């Protein structure tokens, strides 16, 4: 969807012209950044249900009020729904790491998020707490390389900005 | 529309699967021959006017019934129409070659093209020949074996991309058939 | 952004810099138009609230583009100046067309052709003629989307119909120019739940407008006519002619064997010896592709149905007229030496030498003889 | 469009008959329970957000195939779409209950709704369930025996209006069936 | 097991398969102008279009036979009862043989690269085994309509 | 004008959104291609009136008919106008070598070229002969580097395609 | 609009001069710190929501006359208006920082902004303060000495870009003054 290639083809198509020299000049930027983002993608993929385990609980540590009766988490199955809800965001961030743009984020998790969580009484603050706790726990020796963490954190704080 | 990187996420989204290191090497290979695809698209769009004017005249000079009155390429306006009717085809195959898959020409150019040429009275088998000549010229160009004009390249193989632009050109044949 | 009260940007005509913005909206067209008494009233800038003027723009120039709050900030930047009174609703619907959120579902998602139909339906409320598309694809492909969306707003039809202060809406004008542009307009604009996003192609007016003949179906252009203009015809009679239509309007059923390219095929009883009707006229379609690889060459085969082409057959009949008026042969009493059709007949021999012994073959067949004009 | 008072004049206009005192008592009865219909429409539109969010979640939690990938209510955008796709239905049934007959939702909301959901790929039997939950909630509300929240009313009968809102709710059951 | 010469031979047919049917039906008229005559069988586009389709069918049916290298598919869903449907439709059985022999004479000219209008670009050699095999296939289909 | 940066900012502006990650991903492609195109630009610039001298005359060698009376070249001053006309195209190609896109070519030489040369009887074939003669005279040892000649020829044949 | 590479060709076009190796090293330097500008634009747009919400609330909490009735930021709609009225400003300064010169916000955002706020009755000196706070936050972010949240960077100098985004923010001050 909203990738690097699908802006330069849609601009040339809306102008109604051939793929010009600046248009293939921008696909060269993929060759230098894919080596950084694809290795971030599968270090995310091979470790993925760990960072729902050690980070989906941080919202409940920050917001223990929503385990009360009459709240967003009543029983255990709603907590399972919460872990499923945040695992979906972790999957979409992996999809945007491989695409090269924020294409899979917008229409799959972001577009429409404002109404559901308002209508179903889900607080976005508990979402961005769990996302931000995953953001600041990144470091160069253990987690990934120096350039993987950069846009891995950039795709995270994009979601943080869009949810707020 | 959809590029080659975005083709695998809509396949992995159908199973709710993370894209992992088991299918990433097919993408990294696609990135590794980025310059080969890139110079090939450039070699297509460099000589694109003779590519169109040669193909339409070659389609004419084998079937000279279109030039006769009552032909579909008879008058001056209809020849101006046909010279662009295939230039758009080349313009969208150049998009599909750069994007890495045949999604950008299938719903934009090819969707609804059949009944357009049926309702106007365009002979489909003549347009089949006209795009086959363009396919032959394409594999002549991006393999650098055009006997008519040579371009300089770094040495290596390019047939993997030459079969790609061949598989784009029969989709334009099938959608009009 | 540009002026606290503006009239018309880009100065296409010279006479628009003198032209002031209209102080009061343009009135109705002076024809009588019997349908208009049934249709709800127009929505101008003066009478509407800012809630309903936005709802009616989203209902007409967007179809039902089905917009969220997070989607389309660019529509609302243009709305942020309309609500301030910077620009008219004419330049506002120009600004909506140039936006990306209009592009990503109408220029983008659709094809080359019905994007033009989707522009006519969204801006002028109607459907174009074929010669109007003909001078419009030249604007769209060779001059771009920008001049194409500019060509509606600076058009006399838009200026005369909606002015500077009324939202686009479908107008019933009494006397129409063609009789076909009435019901093409009605067919292009159904009522609620229109959903231009649903059908990726519509495939129906894209072949009815594609030629000046072949007017579309009766029932599609009498479906969205208002109630009591068409009721007491829709209990049981045309109702099953309607649901059997709307089933085919789902998935964009193609009209290749229907309304265009119609061909009365021969009776099945005339070819029962040959094959069943589910497989007659299918033939293998072979594509052989050469590339200097061996790893990457390919061959493809597929049986495909081959329709007869009436356009190519009509050209061939016009070409063969020259042989019709050039005589056949002289005759005389000596014809008794050539009893049948054996005048100028001869045996054709073909001899098939090949490497295998079993596949050798000898011919003889008797047939006519004619020399080609190149020899 | 057409209200209940305007329904009898289009019936009398078909015979060129004056509306007289032989059929006027049926409308005078309709005027007599004006406050009952009026408080009922208010009781519908008072708690209308939980009415929608409960019904679609109840339609979800019985058929959890829509939440699976490839489901029609899978992604976040399509769930935002479905939450309004039934809110419009409730919004038009509230019009039809106030107007007194099912003419305002018949050509405005229901005309063309079937092929829209067919061309979109919306599962019709799921939308059948989603609107029958809304019908059950409606007869719970306007009879004031919602065990979940009670509203104060003057005492009396309201079942004549409760069958009315039931007969409105299978009309869009029938229209996309 | 003739690999490359077979694939070069089918390519010389299916590429220029669009000329060959239109040249053959014009040659079919070129002998007999009473076919386009009022009362003829090659009257208006109801019938002229079916002629172009039918000339195309028997053309292609031979290229798959040549690709497979044998005449099995030319008798399976091709030919077992093509004569009697033609006498049931009332086509002239004489000029159909002429139309078939124009295809033969053109295919044997395309394979041997002896076309006066278009010189093809091949590898150096001689396709004498395949120029006669398509003649055998075309006689197989000419023996049927007789 | 039509550069690499002015598509990615206009797309983000027409969408009405911040410069996203794919947007700064495409400016990285400038860092790898500018080193090839800027050295092509000043080898063009320091040698420029040589390649009007030895290439503006090639159209007169190909088309000697237009030095006849009643033609596009009547006297010496029209031939000076012709050399000025082709030096302008050589300047615009240098401007597009430095910009990174075909921006300075479009509205400065190409947009409107179809009417002037039709109305003032100037044949475009003699223009593209002189451009094509400068295109095919490029080679790796003498003229420029291996990658300079690539897009130097690509900006030339773009003009060749647009004039025809 | 105009970027930094396209700024020198419109200067050389005024004298019909070829761009040569006498002014090319100023752009080769601009290319050399491409990654510094690139990470700086990313550091701006990463934390951009708190950048806006903090600045507007800081403009409020020093001048609490706007919250009083008759204030320009009094009601809920006008506060929603003002929260985006500066987000657009940040959105265009992010364009101008990436493009390398102040041409893209010059005629797109700033052209006609003065009489808009004059005709609407927006207090200009309050908007001066609101964009000054955004300038201070910008030089805090792209020098990585925001005491409030730290981002990781490669070591080096970035003040050449920090004066650039300062010179963009006084143009928004001058055009509204
Ligand atoms: C493709 C992307 C994609 C997503 C992001 C999610 C988004 C999402 N979450 C929920 C649904 C939910 N999401 C949550 C999650 C939370 N509530 C809390 O208490 C916490 C704040 C948070 C977990 C940390 C819960 C509890 C529900 C169920 C709410 C309910 O059923 O009432 C629903 C409604 C359908 C359902 O019940 O599953 C949707 C669309 N689903 C998707 O398909
Ligand atoms: C792909 C994303 C990804 C992550 C963010 C982590 C998430 C994560 N971190 C830790 C575990 C840890 N994380 C750190 C933090 C750090 N360690 C250092 O050497 C640095 C100083 C600093 C980088 C931020 C430390 C010190 C521990 C061990 C103690 C602890 O559990 O906190 C654990 C517990 C067990 C484990 O180590 O796996 C998990 C699940 N893992 C992942 O797969
Ligand atoms: C987005 C994709 C896209 C396309 C592919 C073209 C497709 C296309 N072609 C034509 C229209 C046409 N196309 C042709 C072309 C041909 N007829 C022949 O005999 C040859 C086989 C062939 C040229 C090689 C002709 C001759 C016409 C005009 C028909 C006529 O009026 O005589 C039209 C009608 C509009 C008009 O006539 O102006 C359209 C939509 N346009 C598009 O927008
Ligand atoms: C502005 C426009 C512009 C471009 C699009 C690219 C084109 C380009 N191609 C290659 C490099 C190459 N390009 C080719 C491609 C081919 N060689 C052939 O003999 C075939 C004819 C053709 C295949 C279709 C090959 C084989 C290489 C060397 C290997 C490789 O890098 O892929 C390289 C260097 C990469 C490297 O070799 O390390 C570049 C920069 N450059 C530019 O300046
Ligand atoms: C005036 C009356 C009126 C309506 C009734 C609605 C009808 C309607 N719904 C949708 C569009 C839709 N409607 C649904 C709804 C559903 N799909 C399901 O799986 C559930 C059964 C159900 C929710 C309960 C969904 C999911 C889409 C979007 C389809 C998609 O893009 O995935 C569209 C297409 C426009 C768009 O997609 O934005 C329209 C016109 N709109 C109207 O204007
Ligand atoms: C079964 C055996 C058999 C044949 C041998 C030919 C014999 C033959 N020749 C001609 C008819 C003819 N044949 C010739 C040919 C020639 N005249 C000359 O002076 C030269 C000797 C030669 C050219 C070099 C000419 C000129 C005509 C008459 C054409 C005319 O003027 O009407 C006709 C009259 C029918 C017609 O042509 O329409 C017939 C039956 N046909 C047969 O069916
Ligand atoms: C601004 C909003 C607003 C309204 C819409 C009306 C609602 C309203 N309802 C009633 C009055 C009434 N309303 C009801 C209706 C009901 N009682 C029940 O037990 C059922 C739950 C429900 C039927 C659906 C009945 C039974 C009466 C008394 C008899 C009658 O007047 O119809 C009356 C007084 C008439 C009278 O009793 O003489 C008024 C004014 N008032 C307002 O201020
Ligand atoms: C689908 C892919 C595909 C093809 C199109 C053919 C193309 C082809 N033919 C030959 C090679 C050849 N091709 C021919 C064929 C001919 N020579 C002639 O003079 C006649 C025109 C024609 C016979 C009708 C001959 C005689 C040879 C050499 C012997 C042989 O290799 O068979 C070769 C080997 C290298 C070469 O010589 O070019 C290839 C790739 N083979 C394939 O794999
Ligand atoms: C008026 C009466 C009339 C006819 C009798 C025929 C004329 C005709 N031409 C050819 C013969 C041919 N026909 C073709 C076919 C073509 N050549 C090409 O290069 C194109 C690709 C393709 C479509 C034109 C070829 C290649 C030959 C063999 C070479 C030749 O004889 O010209 C043949 C078969 C061999 C022969 O007996 O001469 C016939 C009967 N056409 C007519 O109109
Ligand atoms: C699998 C093998 C296969 C075929 C060979 C064709 C065979 C074939 N031909 C026709 C049918 C026909 N074919 C012709 C064609 C001709 N008549 C003539 O006099 C000439 C010989 C030739 C034109 C040059 C005509 C004129 C009709 C009948 C059209 C009609 O009048 O109904 C039909 C009847 C069905 C139909 O056309 O609707 C079939 C099955 N189809 C096949 O599926
Ligand atoms: C910024 C870009 C830019 C350009 C590309 C040129 C384009 C251009 N050339 C000419 C004008 C001209 N251009 C030519 C050139 C030629 N005629 C020939 O015989 C040859 C085909 C060819 C030279 C090789 C001539 C001879 C004139 C003068 C024609 C006349 O005055 O009648 C004019 C009209 C004004 C004038 O007379 O100078 C313009 C706009 N000028 C520009 O400002
Ligand atoms: C920036 C663009 C640019 C050019 C295209 C040339 C243009 C050019 N080439 C030559 C001159 C030449 N050009 C070549 C051609 C080549 N030499 C080789 O070693 C290769 C095999 C081949 C690359 C195409 C040769 C062999 C000469 C000398 C003989 C001659 O004048 O033709 C001359 C005459 C004097 C000179 O050498 O400068 C000029 C003006 N110069 C430029 O500044
Ligand atoms: C392309 C560039 C672009 C912009 C910069 C903005 C500029 C802008 N702002 C407003 C409109 C406004 N802007 C403000 C903002 C403020 N008033 C204050 O007291 C504070 C100083 C400041 C917020 C920090 C307010 C409050 C309004 C609404 C005025 C009102 O109706 O009360 C309007 C009128 C449109 C509308 O009201 O919806 C426009 C065009 N919009 C654009 O399209
Ligand atoms: C997808 C998003 C994305 C980006 C935008 C870039 C960001 C990026 N920055 C640097 C590299 C750098 N970036 C900076 C910039 C800074 N250092 C500071 O201390 C300041 C806070 C800040 C200045 C504003 C410096 C000083 C270097 C090292 C020198 C340089 O390359 O410029 C490099 C490596 C180049 C090199 O060092 O050789 C990359 C790739 N990478 C990505 O993956």
Swiss-Prot record, chains B, D, G:
Key words, A-Z: Antenna complex, Bile pigment, Chloroplast, Chromophore, Electron transport, Membrane, Methylation, Photosynthesis, Phycobilisome, Plastid, Thylakoid, Transport
Record membrane topology: Peripheral membrane protein
Membrane among keywords: yes
Modification after translation, per record: Contains two covalently linked phycoerythrobilin chromophores and one covalently linked phycourobilin chromophore.
Binding site for (2R,3E)-phycoerythrobilin 1: 82
GO cellular component, one term: phycobilisome
Record SUPFAM superfamilies: Globin-like (SSF46458)
A family per Pfam: Phycobilisome
Subcellular localization, as worded in the UniProt entry: Plastid, Chloroplast thylakoid membrane
Binding site for phycourobilin: 50, 61
Residues modified as N4-methylasparagine: 72
Domain of life: Eukaryota
Function: Light-harvesting photosynthetic bile pigment-protein from the phycobiliprotein complex.
Subunit record text: Heteromer of 6 alpha, 6 beta and one gamma chain.
Family as reported in the entry's similarity comment: Belongs to the phycobiliprotein family.
UniProt protein name: B-phycoerythrin beta chain
Organism whose genome encodes this protein: Porphyridium purpureum (Red alga)
């Amino acid at each position: 969807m909203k990738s690097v290639i699908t802006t330069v083809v849609s601009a040339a198509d809306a102008a109604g012209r051939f793929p010009s020299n600046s248009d293939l000049e921008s696909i060269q930027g993929n060759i230098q950044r894919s080596a950084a983002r694809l290795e971030a993608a599968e270090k995310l993929a091979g470790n993925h249900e760990a960072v729902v385990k050690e980070a989906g609980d941080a919202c409940f540590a920050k917001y223990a009020y929503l385990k009360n009766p009459g709240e967003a988490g009543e029983n255990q199955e709603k907590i399972n729904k919460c872990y499923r809800d945040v695992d979906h965001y972790m999957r979409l961030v992996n999809y945007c790491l491989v695409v090269g743009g924020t294409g899979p984020l917008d229409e799959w998790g972001i577009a429409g998020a404002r109404e559901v969580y308002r209508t179903l009484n889900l607080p976005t603050s508990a979402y961005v707490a769990s996302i931000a706790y995953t953001r600041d726990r990144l470091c160069v020796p253990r987690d990934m390389s120096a350039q993987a963490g950069v846009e891995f954190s950039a795709y995270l704080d994009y979601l943080i900005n869009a949810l707020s | 529309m959809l590029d080659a990187f975005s083709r695998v996420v809509v396949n992995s989204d159908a199973k709710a699967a993370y894209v992992g290191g088991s299918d990433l090497q097919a993408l990294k290979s696609f990135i590794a021959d980025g310059n080969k695809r890139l110079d090939a698209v450039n070699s297509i769009v460099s000589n694109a006017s003779c590519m169109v004017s040669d193909a339409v005249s070659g389609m004419i000079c084998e079937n000279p019934g279109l030039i006769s009155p009552g032909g579909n390429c008879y008058t001056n306006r209809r020849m101006a129409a046909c010279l662009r009717d295939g230039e758009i085809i080349l313009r969208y195959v150049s998009y599909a070659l750069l994007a890495g898959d045949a999604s950008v020409l299938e719903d934009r150019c090819l969707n609804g093209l059949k009944e357009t040429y049926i309702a106007l009275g365009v002979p489909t088998n003549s347009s089949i020949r006209a795009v086959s000549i363009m396919k032959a010229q394409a594999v002549a160009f991006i393999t650098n074996t055009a006997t008519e004009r040579k371009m300089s390249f770094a040495a290596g193989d390019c047939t993997s991309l030459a079969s790609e632009v061949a598989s784009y050109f029969d989709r334009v044949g099938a959608a009009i058939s | 952004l540009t002026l606290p009260g503006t009239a018309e940007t880009n100065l296409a005509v010279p006479s628009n810099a003198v032209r002031k913005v209209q102080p009061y909206p343009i009135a109705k067209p002076p024809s009588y138009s019997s349908v208009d008494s049934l249709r709800p009233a127009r929505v101008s800038r003066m009478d509407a609230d800012w809630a309903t003027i936005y709802e009616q723009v989203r209902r007409q120039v967007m179809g039902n583009a089905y917009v969220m709050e997070g989607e389309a900030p660019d529509i609302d930047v243009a709305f942020s100046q309309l609500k301030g009174g910077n620009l008219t609703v004419r330049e506002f619907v120009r600004a909506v067309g140039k936006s990306a959120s209009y592009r990503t579902r109408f220029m983008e998602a659709k094809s080359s052709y019905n994007f033009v139909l989707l522009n006519f339906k969204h801006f002028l409320g109607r459907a174009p003629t074929q010669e109007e598309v003909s001078t419009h694809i030249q604007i769209l492909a060779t001059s771009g989307l920008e001049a194409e969306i500019d060509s509606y707003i600076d058009s006399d039809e838009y200026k005369a119909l909606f002015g500077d202060h009324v939202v686009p809406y479908v107008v019933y004008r009494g006397t129409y120019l063609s009789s076909e542009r009435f019901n093409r307009m009605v067919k292009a604009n159904p009522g609620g739940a229109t959903s231009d996003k649903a059908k990726s192609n519509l495939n129906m007016i894209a072949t009815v407008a594609a030629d000046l003949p072949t007017d579309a179906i009766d029932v599609m252009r009498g479906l969205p006519s208002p109630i009591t203009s068409e009721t007491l015809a829709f209990g049981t009679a045309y109702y099953w002619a309607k649901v059997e239509k709307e089933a085919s309007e789902g998935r964009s059923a193609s009209p290749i064997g229907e309304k265009i390219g119609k061909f009365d095929h021969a009776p099945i009883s005339t070819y029962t010896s040959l094959c069943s009707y589910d497989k007659v006229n299918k033939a293998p379609q072979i594509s052989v592709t050469n590339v200097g690889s061996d790893e990457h060459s390919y061959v493809s085969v597929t049986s495909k149905y081959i329709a007869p082409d009436m356009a190519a057959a009509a050209q061939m009949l016009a070409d063969c007229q020259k042989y019709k008026a050039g005589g056949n042969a002289p005759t005389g009493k000596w014809m008794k030496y050539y009893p049948g059709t054996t005048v100028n007949m001869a045996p054709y021999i073909s001899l098939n030498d090949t490497g295998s012994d079993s596949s050798r073959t000898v011919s003889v067949t008797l047939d006519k003889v004619k020399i080609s004009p190149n020899k």
